[PDB]
Amino acid sequence: LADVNLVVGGCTVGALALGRFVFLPFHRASLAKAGMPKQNGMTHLQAGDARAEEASFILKTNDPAGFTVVDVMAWGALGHAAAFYILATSSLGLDRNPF
């Protein structure tokens, strides 16, 4: 029924646009309020966990709004999940209405 290309592309573009222009302020505020995980009062890296060091390929990006590549993958994942949910629900031809 629904075009996989059009639905997937539209959902991914919409999710990226929402996460880059709409949900970016709240996301940044929540990230600043939460911060990195801490154990006994200090971050995992400070306690001695070398593998807990934040990756450098996300510390700073050329994007003016700070929209990192990980942000792209997260929002794209949400967009694909919604797109495939729509496609799968539209593929079924049964009556799920409680009426």
Binding site: R51, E53, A55, S56, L59, T61, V69
Partner: peptide, 29 residues
């Protein structure tokens, strides 16, 4: 490997083909 970033500290060019590619930080040891 990515324009606009820095090397993950543990990688500085001493090894051949060092492009600073280590998003997961496996070479921290």
């Amino acid at each position: 490997w990515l324009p606009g970033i820095q090397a993950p500290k543990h990688l500085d060019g001493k090894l051949a083909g060092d492009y600073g590619f280590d998003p997961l930080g496996l070479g921290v040891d």
